[PDB]
Amino acid sequence: MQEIIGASLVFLCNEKCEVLEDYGVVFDEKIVEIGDYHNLTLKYPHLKAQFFENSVLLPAFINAHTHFEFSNNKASFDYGSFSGWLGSVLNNGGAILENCQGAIQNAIMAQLKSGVGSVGAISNHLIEVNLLKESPLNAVVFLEFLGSSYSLEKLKAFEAKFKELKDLEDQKLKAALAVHAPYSVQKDMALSVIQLAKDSQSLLSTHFLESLEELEWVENSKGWFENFYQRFLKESNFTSLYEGANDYIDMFKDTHTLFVHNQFASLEALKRIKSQVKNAFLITCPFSNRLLSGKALDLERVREAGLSVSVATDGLSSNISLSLLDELRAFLLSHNMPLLELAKIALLGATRHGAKALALNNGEIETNKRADLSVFGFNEKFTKEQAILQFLLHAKEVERLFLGGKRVI
Amino acid sequence: QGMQEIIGASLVFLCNEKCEVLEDYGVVFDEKIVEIGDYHNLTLKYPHLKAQFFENSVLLPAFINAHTHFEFSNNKASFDYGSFSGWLGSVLNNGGAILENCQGAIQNAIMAQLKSGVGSVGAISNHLIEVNLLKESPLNAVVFLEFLGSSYSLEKLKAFEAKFKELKDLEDQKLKAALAVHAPYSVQKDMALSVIQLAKDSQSLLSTHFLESLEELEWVENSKGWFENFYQRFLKESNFTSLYEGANDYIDMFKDTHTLFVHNQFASLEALKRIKSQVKNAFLITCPFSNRLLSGKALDLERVREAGLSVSVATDGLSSNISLSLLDELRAFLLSHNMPLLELAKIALLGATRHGAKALALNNGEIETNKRADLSVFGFNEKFTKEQAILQFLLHAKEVERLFLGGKRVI
Ligand SMILES: CSC[C@H]1O[C@@H](n2cnc3c2N=CNC[C@H]3O)[C@H](O)[C@@H]1O
Ligand SMILES: CSC[C@H]1O[C@@H](n2cnc3c2N=CNC[C@H]3O)[C@H](O)[C@@H]1O
Ligand SMILES: [Fe+3]
Ligand SMILES: [Fe+3]
């Protein structure tokens, strides 16, 4: 049933990024009504109402791309190059995935305490699914396929794994699918995964042009990936699995597909993604990009292509923190756009845009959306024009978290 | 106990200019570093000295934070960010209110330094309100008494000379008195010359903020931009032209001095080369988070290299930062520059140790015989590879496990 919450500052997280003072929200499981808090308490004098002075009320965050299974990692993988990182992940041989549950639960709570209400979890083995189901998080689990050599047996085992994930779906868990990358998934295997997504009305995700090594491989079949398949996979393949970026992009034509990273995608490739996929969603991971390729996503190019970004943490396999607030501050440091303008992009990248990417009914304070709401408390009240930036700079731990109208924190 | 002891760790960062990394090495030290070598061989050579080895840990010099403003430690959201003019205007409009009831935040700021591995601080001070707490802290302190004043006044000079004498009388083995000229837009030329002369007469170090914003650059070079109305609007002073005709006019005042130049992101290559050739002993200080919050432009490290200079990394104050942990500042530094990460990690580490020690004329910042025994130990859950050790340390180091200052255990 219904209650009223208000704060000195409310971030609607519409595309305008509206900031409202002394506003309130009536909600049960959904957002019922928005308005001035005092007027709301007069209009509904019999409801529970709480006001949080010197606080910010905003939608719970959406973290559209993380790898919970790698939550054990601290220094198991090399940083400073993508090729060095990928080689270290493969040479690790999955050892970091063992004894996983403690780090995954710690990872889940880092999300919730950071204000994250919804997660796009990339999963290769569904080892994190149980803990996610037991958490209050909204979860879209992308079962991610790996395989550079076609095998009908591996397809059937993968479709059997996806059926197990589908049978766990409920109001908090949506099953989805992922193609790992252009260098790691053979074309006909990827086409099969994409077809299964269409047959099951599932979302799609993929890592795209994350490194110069991948760009030189995809475009000219040269560079570091020349020996990658023999050295690491014991596969006799010495040419790219896809002749050019367009060959890969076109597989996702007329789909709802998340494209992650993308820093080495030219303006031609980004425009192709928009025009071919129709419902594409660019995901940016600032800290992961700095640790691996070392190149940040060119946001001006993204704007020139007519696209927008959601900001995600990635996994601890390529990050030091799963707090989305930490990622948003790294995002502010990773781009030289005017900070006040960049703060709005960061906030929308953590709310409305991620919700649209995951096809969730949240990420914005608007009637009929889910009552996924965060309250962050501070020692002062920010000015209207500084509110968003100061929030991103100082927000560390959530003071109140409501998910589906129920108090979680 | 002024006796000697041995400490070793799986990884030791010497922080020489080579940035040497050594495995299973140890250090013998009393108040100074006495001997360096393989830890096991050190325990055989000195079997009666007290000896500890820290597995899966990093031993390195205590950090030097060459530029901070402790007096502004109360600040969280009192000042505007997103532009330098917006920030400076908000600081002035604050009217010093954030400076009142200061001691609680200053003690918290001090302790944030120590737990971050910082052993030495370059503290910029306008009123010496933080000096007392600094003195009874174990930190090595170089307090730069900073002069502000855009209109010449002999009375203001004499009161400033008198405040510096008050600071000089507090000097000891842990406190060095120094002087600072705030900025080209805030200090009248003959007032700055007087401060610089006082530093020479007292053999004091100097520090200054230089070309931190586009607004300052347009003012200094062409007497145009936001600073046109700054003196009437904020200071009630009838001044409409720059206090210095060009950057070289300001730089040349510090000719043949030991002067720290802070920020500098809007200094051209010629200006940086002028600083190097004229000052002779200049030290560039970079504050990545403050630069992002104010002007929004990062220091061009390639330009700094082209000018033949190097940088030390500092936190600035909470007036223009969210954390005074130098480790947080170093991670922000890694995010603020697109240089190859392994190469940038070496610059960051040396920027927090040896370079800052040289800037403050301190006998530390490096694990070398006869240097001060200012040593940090950071513990981890794994042993880093030799080539990843410095970067992984910067990424994962949060709180120090052991801090020794002058050979005495502090943490
Ligand atoms: C062992 S092949 C690559 C594996 O690394 C995993 N991964 C973890 N974090 C990331 C991963 N993949 C690509 N780029 C970095 C980041 O997205 C990915 O799921 C895949 O299982
Ligand atoms: C014209 S008043 C400026 C005052 O702000 C203080 N300040 C605090 N942090 C910084 C300050 N000065 C210049 N740029 C930003 C940073 O260095 C400075 O010491 C001075 O007292
Ligand atoms: Fe990923
Ligand atoms: Fe400063």
3-state secondary structure of A218: helix
Cβ contacts of B88 within 8 Å, gap of 6 or more: none
Closest ligand 1 atom number to CA of residue A70: 8
Pocket test for ligand 2, best of B70, B91, B187, B226 (most atoms within 8 A of CB): B91
The span from the CA of B118 to the CA of B65, in Å, is: 7
**Radius of gyration (C-alpha) of chain B in whole angstroms:** 21
Pocket test for ligand 2, best of B65, B69, B79 (most atoms within 8 A of CB): B69
Gap from CA of B72 to ligand 4 centroid (Å): 10
* Candidates B76, B81, B331; nearest CB to A389: B81
Which H or E run contains B35?
Answer: strand B33-38
In b/e form, how buried is each residue of A377-386, taking b as 16+ CB within 10 angstroms? Answer: bbeebbeeeb
Phi and psi of A102, rounded to 5°?
A: -60, -45
Q: Are residues B55 and B147 in the same domain?
A: no
Find chain A residues with C-beta within 8 A of B396's C-beta.
74-75, 320
Number of other CB atoms surrounding residue A90 within 10 Å: 14
Q: How many CA atoms lie within 13 A of B62 on its CB side?
A: 31
Cα distance from B109 to chain A (closest Cα, Å)? 16
Cβ contacts of A163 within 8 Å, gap of 6 or more: none
Q: Are residues A282 and A401 in the same domain?
A: no
Write B93-99 long-range contacts (CB < 8 A, 24+): B98/B72, B98/B74, B98/B319, B99/B71, B99/B72, B99/B74, B99/B127, B99/B129
Which H or E run contains A166?
Answer: helix A152-166
* Structure token pair of residue A260: 């992650």
| Beta bridge partners of residue B375, listed in sequence order | B61, B404
The span from the CA of B404 to the CA of B411, in Å, is: 7
Q: Domain range holding A358?
A: 61-364
**Chain B interface mutation, best of A72, A317, A326, A332, highest count of B Cβ atoms under 10 Å:** A332
Query: Which-ligand-closest: CA of A65?
Result: 3
* CB of B15 closer than 8 Å to CB of B366: yes
Q: Do A295 and B338 touch (CB under 8 A)?
A: yes
Q: Are residues B279 and B381 in the same domain?
A: no
Q: E strands within A306-384?
A: 309-311, 373-377
Q: What is the dihedral of CA B320, B324, B328, B334, to 10 degrees?
A: 50
* CB of A361 closer than 8 Å to CB of A372: no
**Radius of gyration (C-alpha) of chain A in whole angstroms:** 21
Q: Do B341 and A382 touch (CB under 8 A)?
A: no
* Structure token pair of residue B348: 């960051």
Closest ligand 2 atom number to CA of residue B294: 15
If one counts the domains in chain A, the total is: 2
Closest CA to B397 of B76, B28, B9, B5: B9
* CB of B177 closer than 8 Å to CB of B171: yes
Q: Do B395 and A290 touch (CB under 8 A)?
A: no
Q: Do B288 and A333 touch (CB under 8 A)?
A: yes
Closest CA to A13 of A25, A3, A4: A25
Cα distance from A320 to chain B (closest Cα, Å)? 7
Find chain B residues with C-beta within 8 A of A336's C-beta.
296-298
Question: Does the Cβ of A144 fall within 6 Å of ligand 1?
Answer: yes
Which residue type occupies A372? D
Q: Are residues A35 and A67 in the same domain?
A: no
The span from the CA of A50 to the CA of B120, in Å, is: 47
| Beta bridge partners of residue B264, listed in sequence order | none
Find chain B residues with C-beta within 8 A of A320's C-beta.
331, 395-396
Q: How far is CA A4 from CA A36, A225, B49, in A?
A: 11, 56, 67
Find chain A residues with C-beta within 8 A of B299's C-beta.
none
Gap from CA of A86 to ligand 1 centroid (Å): 8
Q: Are residues B18 and B111 in the same domain?
A: no
3-state secondary structure of B384: coil
Q: Are residues A46 and A68 in the same domain?
A: no
Question: Does the Cβ of A70 fall within 6 Å of ligand 1?
Answer: yes
3-state secondary structure of A259: strand
The DSSP letter of residue A147 is B
Q: Are residues A301 and A402 in the same domain?
A: no
Which H or E run contains A357?
Answer: helix A352-357
**In chain A, whose CA is at the least distance from the CA of B394?**
A320
Q: Are residues A6 and A54 in the same domain?
A: yes
Cβ contacts of B326 within 8 Å, gap of 6 or more: B63, B65, B113, B116, B117, B118, B313, B314, B315, B352
Phi and psi of A132, rounded to 5°?
A: -60, -45
DSSP labels for B163-222? HHHHHHTT--SSEEEEEEE--TTTB-HHHHHHHHHHHHHTT--EEEEES-SHHHHHHHHH
Q: Are residues A100 and A38 in the same domain?
A: no
Q: How far is CA A160 from CA A166, A178, A195, A257, B106, in A?
A: 10, 15, 15, 22, 61
Closest CA to B411 of B175, B40, B118: B118
Find chain B residues with C-beta within 8 A of A390's C-beta.
77, 81
The verdict on whether residue B337 carries a ligand-binding annotation is no
Q: Are residues B382 and B280 in the same domain?
A: no
Cβ contacts of B79 within 8 Å, gap of 6 or more: B87, B90, B91, B94, B319, B320
**In chain B, whose CA is at the least distance from the CA of A392?**
B322
Q: Do B338 and A296 touch (CB under 8 A)?
A: yes
Cα distance from B411 to chain A (closest Cα, Å)? 25
The span from the CA of B180 to the CA of B144, in Å, is: 5
Q: Which residues of A are annotated as a binding site for Fe(3+)?
A: 65, 67, 207, 314
Angle B189-201/B154-168 helices, nearest 10 degrees? 30
The span from the CA of B315 to the CA of B329, in Å, is: 6
The DSSP letter of residue A37 is H
Task: Tell me the torsion sign for CA atoms B338, B15, A86, A229.
Answer: positive
Closest CA to A307 of A267, A340, A347: A267
CA A111 to chain centre: 12
Q: Do B384 and A75 touch (CB under 8 A)?
A: yes
Question: Does the Cβ of A256 fall within 6 Å of ligand 1?
Answer: no
Q: Do B338 and A380 touch (CB under 8 A)?
A: no
* Candidates B76, B82, B385; nearest CB to A389: B82
Q: How many CA atoms lie within 13 A of B282 on its CB side?
A: 30
* CB of B391 closer than 8 Å to CB of A80: yes
3-state secondary structure of B360: coil
In b/e form, how buried is each residue of A197-208, taking b as 16+ CB within 10 angstroms? Answer: beeeebbbbbbb
The span from the CA of B334 to the CA of B288, in Å, is: 9
Cβ contacts of A104 within 8 Å, gap of 6 or more: A68, A69, A71, A127, A128, A131
Q: Are residues A127 and A83 in the same domain?
A: yes
Angle at A44 between CA A40 and CA A48, to 5 degrees: 90
* Structure token pair of residue A2: 């219904």
The verdict on whether residue B67 carries a ligand-binding annotation is yes
Q: How many CA atoms lie within 13 A of A31 on its CB side?
A: 24
* Structure token pair of residue A202: 């599932």
Q: How many CA atoms lie within 13 A of B311 on its CB side?
A: 29
Cβ contacts of A16 within 8 Å, gap of 6 or more: none
Closest CA to B22 of B395, B375, B349, B386: B386
Q: How was this structure determined?
A: X-ray
Q: Are residues B311 and B274 in the same domain?
A: yes
Which H or E run contains A374?
Answer: strand A373-377
Give the domain-ending residue among A334, A349, A364. A364
Residue with structure tokens 């205007």? B89
Question: Does the Cβ of A67 fall within 6 Å of ligand 1?
Answer: yes
* CB of A346 closer than 8 Å to CB of A333: no
For chain B, the residues before each gap (C–N > 2.5 Å) are none
Q: Do A333 and B338 touch (CB under 8 A)?
A: no
The DSSP letter of residue A384 is T
Strand arrangement of the beta sheet that strand B280-286 belongs to: B63-68, B118-125, B140-147, B175-181, B206-210, B257-263, B280-286, B311-313
The experimental resolution of this structure, in angstroms, equals: 1.9
Residue with structure tokens 């820093």? A263
**In chain A, whose CA is at the least distance from the CA of B393?**
A75
Find chain A residues with C-beta within 8 A of B296's C-beta.
336, 338-339
Find chain A residues with C-beta within 8 A of B335's C-beta.
286-287, 290, 330, 333-334
Gap from CA of B28 to ligand 4 centroid (Å): 37
Question: Does the Cβ of A65 fall within 6 Å of ligand 1?
Answer: no
The span from the CA of A95 to the CA of A76, in Å, is: 9
Phi and psi of A18, rounded to 5°?
A: -65, 135
Task: Tell me the torsion sign for CA atoms A79, A85, A89, A90.
Answer: negative
